mmCIF file of C-alpha atoms and ligand atoms in Angstrom:
data_model
loop_
_atom_site.group_PDB
_atom_site.id
_atom_site.type_symbol
_atom_site.label_atom_id
_atom_site.label_comp_id
_atom_site.label_asym_id
_atom_site.label_seq_id
_atom_site.Cartn_x
_atom_site.Cartn_y
_atom_site.Cartn_z
ATOM 1 C CA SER A 1 2.648 -12.337 -11.793
ATOM 2 C CA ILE A 2 4.366 -9.560 -9.783
ATOM 3 C CA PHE A 3 4.412 -5.901 -8.996
ATOM 4 C CA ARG A 4 6.930 -3.504 -9.843
ATOM 5 C CA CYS A 5 7.459 0.274 -9.053
ATOM 6 C CA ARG A 6 6.227 1.724 -12.166
ATOM 7 C CA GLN A 7 9.028 4.782 -12.027
ATOM 8 C CA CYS A 8 11.874 2.743 -11.832
ATOM 9 C CA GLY A 9 11.060 -1.047 -11.940
ATOM 10 C CA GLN A 10 11.840 -1.903 -8.095
ATOM 11 C CA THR A 11 10.206 -5.338 -7.093
ATOM 12 C CA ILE A 12 7.750 -4.737 -4.644
ATOM 13 C CA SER A 13 4.631 -7.538 -4.247
ATOM 14 C CA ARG A 14 3.238 -10.278 -6.055
ATOM 15 C CA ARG A 15 -0.510 -10.643 -7.176
ATOM 16 C CA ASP A 16 -0.218 -13.934 -4.824
ATOM 17 C CA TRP A 17 0.545 -11.667 -1.946
ATOM 18 C CA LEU A 18 -3.034 -9.695 -2.199
ATOM 19 C CA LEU A 19 -5.278 -9.538 0.897
ATOM 20 C CA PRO A 20 -8.802 -8.708 0.916
ATOM 21 C CA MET A 21 -9.346 -6.361 3.809
ATOM 22 C CA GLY A 22 -12.731 -6.054 4.792
ATOM 23 C CA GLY A 23 -14.048 -8.406 1.751
ATOM 24 C CA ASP A 24 -12.087 -6.521 -0.994
ATOM 25 C CA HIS A 25 -8.422 -6.065 -1.827
ATOM 26 C CA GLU A 26 -9.454 -2.799 -3.624
ATOM 27 C CA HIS A 27 -10.398 0.196 -1.393
ATOM 28 C CA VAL A 28 -11.206 3.718 -3.130
ATOM 29 C CA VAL A 29 -10.384 6.614 -0.665
ATOM 30 C CA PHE A 30 -9.371 10.102 -0.211
ATOM 31 C CA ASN A 31 -6.991 11.930 2.128
ATOM 32 C CA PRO A 32 -7.151 15.301 3.821
ATOM 33 C CA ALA A 33 -5.831 16.823 0.571
ATOM 34 C CA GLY A 34 -8.426 15.798 -1.416
ATOM 35 C CA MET A 35 -6.363 13.194 -2.971
ATOM 36 C CA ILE A 36 -8.044 10.122 -4.213
ATOM 37 C CA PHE A 37 -6.376 6.714 -4.260
ATOM 38 C CA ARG A 38 -7.118 3.492 -5.673
ATOM 39 C CA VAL A 39 -5.290 1.555 -2.847
ATOM 40 C CA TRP A 40 -4.780 -2.450 -2.877
ATOM 41 C CA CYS A 41 -4.055 -4.396 0.421
ATOM 42 C CA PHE A 42 -1.216 -6.555 0.131
ATOM 43 C CA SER A 43 -0.378 -8.790 3.204
ATOM 44 C CA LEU A 44 3.242 -8.495 2.180
ATOM 45 C CA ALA A 45 5.588 -6.333 0.161
ATOM 46 C CA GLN A 46 9.545 -5.557 -0.108
ATOM 47 C CA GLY A 47 11.570 -2.818 -1.577
ATOM 48 C CA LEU A 48 10.076 -0.139 0.133
ATOM 49 C CA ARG A 49 11.244 1.950 2.693
ATOM 50 C CA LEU A 50 9.121 2.980 5.583
ATOM 51 C CA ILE A 51 9.370 6.557 6.515
ATOM 52 C CA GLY A 52 8.546 8.177 10.069
ATOM 53 C CA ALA A 53 6.487 6.748 13.119
ATOM 54 C CA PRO A 54 3.238 5.306 12.924
ATOM 55 C CA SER A 55 0.234 7.953 13.076
ATOM 56 C CA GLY A 56 -3.856 7.077 13.399
ATOM 57 C CA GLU A 57 -4.452 10.487 12.088
ATOM 58 C CA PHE A 58 -7.276 9.818 9.222
ATOM 59 C CA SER A 59 -6.330 6.050 9.024
ATOM 60 C CA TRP A 60 -8.738 4.711 6.565
ATOM 61 C CA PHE A 61 -8.539 0.931 8.342
ATOM 62 C CA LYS A 62 -10.102 0.891 11.485
ATOM 63 C CA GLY A 63 -7.782 0.036 14.084
ATOM 64 C CA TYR A 64 -4.497 0.612 12.066
ATOM 65 C CA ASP A 65 -1.825 3.132 12.270
ATOM 66 C CA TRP A 66 0.007 4.018 9.170
ATOM 67 C CA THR A 67 3.403 4.734 7.879
ATOM 68 C CA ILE A 68 4.193 6.210 4.508
ATOM 69 C CA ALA A 69 5.980 3.574 2.307
ATOM 70 C CA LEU A 70 8.217 4.913 -0.558
ATOM 71 C CA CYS A 71 9.707 2.842 -3.531
ATOM 72 C CA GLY A 72 13.123 2.193 -1.309
ATOM 73 C CA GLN A 73 15.074 2.448 -5.014
ATOM 74 C CA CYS A 74 13.543 5.931 -6.495
ATOM 75 C CA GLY A 75 11.658 7.635 -3.546
ATOM 76 C CA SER A 76 7.792 7.360 -5.361
ATOM 77 C CA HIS A 77 5.311 7.444 -3.049
ATOM 78 C CA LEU A 78 3.963 3.884 -3.276
ATOM 79 C CA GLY A 79 1.398 3.742 -0.513
ATOM 80 C CA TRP A 80 1.553 2.832 3.295
ATOM 81 C CA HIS A 81 2.601 0.264 5.876
ATOM 82 C CA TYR A 82 -0.520 -0.520 8.250
ATOM 83 C CA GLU A 83 0.432 -1.776 11.728
ATOM 84 C CA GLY A 84 -0.940 -1.961 15.361
ATOM 85 C CA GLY A 85 -4.373 -3.494 14.528
ATOM 86 C CA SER A 86 -5.655 -6.903 14.485
ATOM 87 C CA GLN A 87 -6.283 -9.761 12.402
ATOM 88 C CA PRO A 88 -3.606 -9.023 10.866
ATOM 89 C CA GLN A 89 -1.705 -6.879 12.980
ATOM 90 C CA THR A 90 0.006 -5.311 9.955
ATOM 91 C CA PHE A 91 -0.258 -5.203 6.013
ATOM 92 C CA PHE A 92 0.559 -2.810 3.147
ATOM 93 C CA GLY A 93 -1.750 -0.732 1.180
ATOM 94 C CA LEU A 94 -0.581 0.219 -2.035
ATOM 95 C CA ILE A 95 -1.537 2.459 -4.534
ATOM 96 C CA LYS A 96 -2.543 0.387 -7.593
ATOM 97 C CA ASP A 97 -1.548 2.951 -10.728
ATOM 98 C CA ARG A 98 1.904 3.377 -9.195
ATOM 99 C CA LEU A 99 2.786 -0.171 -9.996
ATOM 100 C CA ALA A 100 3.367 -2.204 -12.976
ATOM 101 C CA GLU A 101 2.056 -5.820 -13.265
ATOM 102 C CA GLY A 102 4.472 -8.408 -15.251
ATOM 103 C CA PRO A 103 6.044 -11.569 -15.199
ATOM 104 C CA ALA A 104 7.966 -13.167 -12.324
HETATM 105 C C1 JPQ B 201 1.286 12.566 3.232
HETATM 106 C C2 JPQ B 201 0.006 11.417 2.754
HETATM 107 C C3 JPQ B 201 -0.168 11.511 1.349
HETATM 108 C C4 JPQ B 201 -0.284 10.956 3.937
HETATM 109 C C5 JPQ B 201 -1.812 10.284 3.593
HETATM 110 O O1 JPQ B 201 -2.524 10.458 2.421
HETATM 111 N N1 JPQ B 201 -2.196 9.237 4.400
HETATM 112 C C6 JPQ B 201 -3.120 8.547 4.637
HETATM 113 C C7 JPQ B 201 -3.144 7.161 4.910
HETATM 114 C C8 JPQ B 201 -4.451 6.782 5.787
HETATM 115 O O2 JPQ B 201 -5.137 5.613 6.038
HETATM 116 N N2 JPQ B 201 -5.264 7.886 5.579
HETATM 117 C C9 JPQ B 201 -4.692 8.845 4.894
HETATM 118 O O3 JPQ B 201 -5.033 10.402 5.274
HETATM 119 ZN ZN1 ZN B 202 10.531 3.338 -7.745
#
């Protein structure tokens, strides 16, 4: 079972790659613009384009800096890559409702 970009079908991640950060792969969070995201943490993802330099500002995950992750194919905002932390150093937080799940 794999996750594709809902807008264009780009291959992004797999159910096998889910990561229970702080005990749960799912985290419901809001940014400073008041947008709610249901974020699923993954150890790995592909097919993204990470934009800009990392920032710790308003990070939802203690110890991690984030970079915006777009679908590399269509440019849809799919979530964030997190880095600079520990155990693990890096991971992806993807917006669940921007993905489509289906057969490998
Ligand atoms: C431009 C956007 C859409 C930024 C954003 O929402 N950043 C998240 C990432 C994070 O961990 N905390 C935030 O506020
Ligand atoms: Zn896409």
